[PDB]
């Protein structure tokens, strides 16, 4: 009811509406057909305030979609440094693997978010973590030809 | 000229016959349609890409086509859609007056040169270039009642049997099949394919090989060996013609010598090309034909011919098949024509009654009864000459015109009857003098009425196209009325009318007519006594006039504005919108709930519900559906409660209960091709390669600002879809190359299985049709089924898809919009109650300027039309007034006197505004032309009052007040006679037409007879 | 692209010229085949000829020749235009700041300005004084031979890896009964 | 280098080009600027 | 090329002829499907 | 009048068993009896 | 040929009406036209 | 319409002589035109 309204508000970035919905008691575990909670969407679209507001209102930080991807995966992949930090502070699994064995470090390394990679390493990201193809964040950096990223890993 | 034909009544009769024959000939040869070509010429480039997403379609097809749409003449703008149904529709709208054939061939030609740049799959499917128009003559629905046929089974029959016959039918333009004919569906099994070490690539290779037309050659072909006895054509492979033949398509032979056929690894059946659209007519499987009217064709004859041909097909139809007509414009054109002929006859009947009531002789009552038909027939001839058609706009233009034709008839005859009654002249001499008095004014009235109606024909775009229909009709009818009034009706008066003795006002008569003459002679004396008192105290009445002009101006603005109103057309849609990721099974259940509702609760009003799943106005995703609700006759649905407006709100109100569905009913626009509903059509454009996501943010930012102005903007929404979750799959090139699996074989397996691959053509019962390889439903449903598909490596091992793939969820557009070859987002909205669209647009421009850098905007459709046409209005009002003034100046030989006539304008208008205000009507086109005809007839009255008044002062040397009182006296009877004919008498358009006059006349008649003499005296005294 | 005057003439110009027949009000025809790879066949018509129909007729014949032309020539896009030989005007574009180079300016005009001007009614032909950007793969024969690869392999890889794939949908039509999810399948997209 | 279509009006076409360029100028990058180094239409306007 | 009249008629002539609806001033339409492979669909229009 | 047609049937299985592709069969048959337009050549400076 | 013959009657009909009406207007009579138009058969038999 | 005195001549290969032969023919014609300054002035090829 209000869960399908929160999912739209979280995606759009309507801070005021999410706040009003949190007061009315909108379900923060309300997901779409792929299993994306409002935190997933807020993390994907880079809505920092909503991410903070949702976590305050008892949202699952380690919630996973039907392919095992958590909000930190999305935040790390789409270069939302502030959200990545907020999620990790609220106890986000930094070494979380999706169904492909891919981690937030792999995704951040791929798109080349050097700042985010450093934040993930700070909170204890397994640099030697391999995907289903046996490839690390280092193996990505050399393939992409990222000199700065290659040095860090 | 009157003098000429008074002495030559046979000539006058010959001209009348030539006009009647020309008119009678025109009526038969004239086209017939509901509405003419109003919308500007639009050419839509349609294409299909099986299994392609919005972006794949856009970035391979749409952009390539859009880049190659140069060197095309008279193009105003270009809009394109690219959605996840694998569809692209590029609409190119052209300048009004462009040759639609030349426009299309230029678009067609530039596309054909861009075809080698499109994908092979799109080239194979083909790109359609058609004249963009949803103005169907009728929709012929084909249904199966006994449930023996599916939607596929019906569509195939309609295509193979009916479609070509409806195409052949006399007066039929374009025929669209509501569905696809059969296709050879190969439903592959990945468990079977993997078992025999095969892929969809092998299935496609085998179908391409074993289902083909092979050129062999000839026996004894030239150059031959001299002495050859026979020359025969050689036949090798031809196309397959059965599911059996396709079954035996040999894929592989094993070591033991066993045959692996196509039937072993795939299910094979005659299915449909498309499964995205599910159409139902009251819950029963249905197809249909979208018939259009051909250029210069008769809608009534075409519709009859279509039904006549469908009747000859009745015997050949399969068991359970029925023909239905959910949409038909034919009944409207019948009424439009019928209600003109009704008014035409009622007018003639009422004139006769009033003519006899006052003049009291049958010989006089026949002069209008001849004149009016002659002019009306003449109008039909002039419409044919200028290339116009019999339609609503031209027909209701004639209804309004009849008022002017009736006046010209009464005016000429009454003036002869008076001149005879007052002087005692013989009819022939009386007509000479009578015409001598009015002949100058009649010519003047023609130029004034020309100066009123002609200018609105020079409006630009859609608005001008509509006004042109009324303008030419009324000007033609009016122009011929004056010609007939100067040629025929004088000659009739001089020959048919009987001598009246000098001073015989029929007061010496007995009975009703004896009483009436004494009664009316009193009323005429009391009238002149009243006007006598009015002209003593003019200043007071000039204050009462300014109260009316203030009242008019105020009551004009407060009345709601429109072009063509939303009327009960016996049809209305019901949009069914499920959330992102919803399937067609979920959508169908809501469509069933919508269908059930209308057939249960609205059984009295609703005839049928055409429930189309996976459709809007174009093909949409599984999560969308529309229901075309067809109502019963208006005779079966009495009361305002059982009209679309109330039925719509009741339906929308009841469907607020439905969970996980935005279900709402809405009425059809009068002309859909424009979609004009008051408001605007705003385009938000990416001008700096910002991307889709950045354009979405800017749109949300604009929608937010618009929502903070309810006082100015109302219902400001996007005409687009929000980003939906989509299944991203990444093929590892390293793991593919390492295992010896080619990416072509990988992308083909995925594309063919999950998306469907159009392989080649086969021949089903003498008709060429498409062959489609695709995965059987249950193996291409969920992401877990990805790994069930195997691709053969170079070494011969079968590698599963999970081995060299890695999938994740992301968000992407299910429908990407572009405007003028730039990424856009269409935004609809309207002005708030008591606000103009011009104001609302000016705010949208203001709000749009505060959006991020690189985000531009533009106006399209009705906005573009209203933007340009609105700027012309002041220039046309100026010419209209300036020329009206100049015409009267030449008539009265005075710069001052014309004002006395022109001051009548508000007296005609005020009545219609009061009538419209209290009945709660809108300022629609029908009403606006209604005001022009009310003003015209009001001016006509005043023109003859002033002419008579000025003539008495000039010729007979009478005083200002004497001449005025003597003039208004002479002109009282003919003004009341015309006015009485309306009072006796003489369906939303019918209201706008009738009420655009009735209220006007009831007041205008009373106001004019008292105020015209004031204007003349006041103006004459001033100058 | 990369053809000499004769290759161009013998594989395109002649093939097109031979199909130009039964065209109304044609005075004469002149063609130029040059070593840039460019063909230009001008068909001059009688004074009073409808340029719209002249274009329609000329292209009707070209479309018969189109399939006989090389795939490289078709994929470059053949253009039929009914314009003056001289220039109406020249719309110059400079960068006063000097932030953008001659190549950067040409690309912008091509990508952001040219198309809209080419669609404008009255504009018979637009000619970019420059070139729109392309993904230039500048091959090294020393490095190609080293790893035992050819321009053939380079072209095979690009078409295969820089692909835009139509991969279908999850819960697509016709679906199984009880399907709850419907989502577009996104495989390979064009490299950016 | 814009070339006039056969029969098309030079002044009318030139006016439409300037109108379309006027819609582009606002969204130019920093530094980019239009210049008119060759136009045959001004002579027609002035000489008339 | 190398297609009998029937194959030619079903795959070409029928497909073209069925799309020859909505053409102004069409008196009649005659077509030949030959064993050479050739099709010739002639559309004769109203005089004028 | 109806003409005689020499219908030659290619056994798809028998060909696959012997290891001959039907592309080579269809081309050999097609090119031999019917003729095959391969490409153009220049005869005294003209495309033929 | 069929068209030529099928429209010939209505051609003669309107041709007579027009000539009749033209005489009626010119000579301001209904008798002169009728007295004249009766001559037509005397000519037509000659041509036949 | 061209220039006042100017003419536009086209030398044609009628018998399929080739480019080299047509060049010789052109070079010869240009030389003969150069020997008549009294009649012809600036006779040159419009090519490369
Ligand atoms: C004014 O016009 C109306 C009817 C014309 O009558 C018809 C017969 O003619 C149509 C024309 C010429 C269109 O252009 C349409 C259109 O673009 C549609 C839809 C819808 O399906 C339509 O339904 C039409 C449509 C008609 O039925 N939008 C789409 O498909 C898309 C991509 C819609 C996206 C979002 C929503 C769902 C949509 O924006 C909604 C919020 C409203 O704006 C419309 C439903 C309007 O209804 C109203 C006034 O509430 C119609 C345009
Ligand atoms: C009489 O004509 C003149 C103006 C036409 O007015 C214009 C607007 O219309 C033109 C047309 C319809 C052409 O066909 C041209 C042409 O073919 C040219 C050149 C050359 O740029 C042109 O310039 C035009 C040209 C025009 O400017 N030749 C070439 O490009 C090639 C491939 C080679 C050039 C060879 C030499 C160098 C050239 O022949 C030269 C010797 C002169 O003969 C010309 C430059 C003429 O200059 C004058 C004033 O003597 C013009 C043709
Ligand atoms: C497609 C558009 C259609 C265009 C149609 C154009 C047709 C052209 C017609 C040309 C008319 C000729 C010029 C007028 C004639 C005047 C001189 C006639 C000789 C003469 O002595 O004058 C009298 C005329 O009457 C007078 O004193 C004046 C009256 C003149 C009568 C004019 C007759 C024209 C009839 C045309 C019919 C078509 C109508 C379509 C609008 C003769 O006659 P009379 O007095 O001796 O009489 C018989 C009494 N016993
Ligand atoms: C292709 C197929 C199409 C088929 C469609 C139908 C075609 C319609 C064709 C129209 C034919 C015209 C018919 C004319 C009617 C003539 C009436 C006879 C009059 C008559 O003989 O009396 C005259 C006196 O008339 C008088 O008393 C004076 C005249 C006043 C009365 C005139 C009334 C005419 C009414 C016409 C209505 C026709 C409607 C048709 C739609 C005598 O002669 P005279 O004494 O004058 O001559 C000598 C002067 N010294
Ligand atoms: C001063 C000069 C008047 C002298 C003549 C006056 C009377 C004429 C007598 C004629 C004999 C019949 O008398 C006539 O009957 C008709 C009936 O149609 C009536 O005429 C009228 O009378 C009634 C009222 O009584 C009206 O409502 C009605 O409109 C009408 O019927 C009159 O009563 C009379 O005008
Ligand atoms: C609400 C809708 C708009 C209302 C429009 C009203 C206009 C139509 C009604 C006009 C009726 C005319 O009524 C007429 O009025 C004038 C005064 O104004 C009267 O005249 C009166 O004033 C004059 C001037 O001082 C005196 O000389 C005269 O003796 C006296 O009777 C007439 O005797 C009367 O017949
Ligand atoms: C470009 C459009 C310009 C026209 C616009 C003006 C339209 C108004 C037309 C005015 C109506 C005619 O005006 C009226 O005509 C009649 C004849 O019919 C004139 O009367 C005239 O009759 C005849 C015929 O012309 C003359 O020989 C005679 O000298 C004169 O008395 C009147 O003196 C005049 O007042
Ligand atoms: C005065 C003669 C008028 C004739 C018009 C037909």
Author numbering:
A (entry chain D): 13 to 165
B (entry chain B): 1 to 986, 997 to 1033
C (entry chain A): 50 to 241
D (entry chain A): 290 to 337
E (entry chain C): 50 to 97
F (entry chain C): 722 to 769
G (entry chain C): 866 to 913
H (entry chain A): 674 to 721
Task: Provide the authors' original text about this structure.
The E. coli AcrAB-TolC drug efflux pump contains the inner membrane H+/drug antiporter AcrB comprising three functionally interdependent protomers, cycling consecutively through the loose (L), tight (T) and open (O) state during cooperative catalysis. AcrB is the homotrimeric IM proton-motive force-driven H+/drug antiporter component which recognizes and actively transports multiple drugs (antibiotics, detergents, dyes, and solvents) via the tightly connected AcrA and TolC channels across the OM, leading to an observable resistance phenotype. Four different entry channels (CH1–CH4) have been described with putative entrances from the periplasm or the outer leaflet of the IM toward the two drug-binding pockets, the access pocket (AP) and deep binding pocket (DBP) inside the AcrB pump. Here, we present 13 X-ray structures of AcrB in intermediate states of the transport cycle.
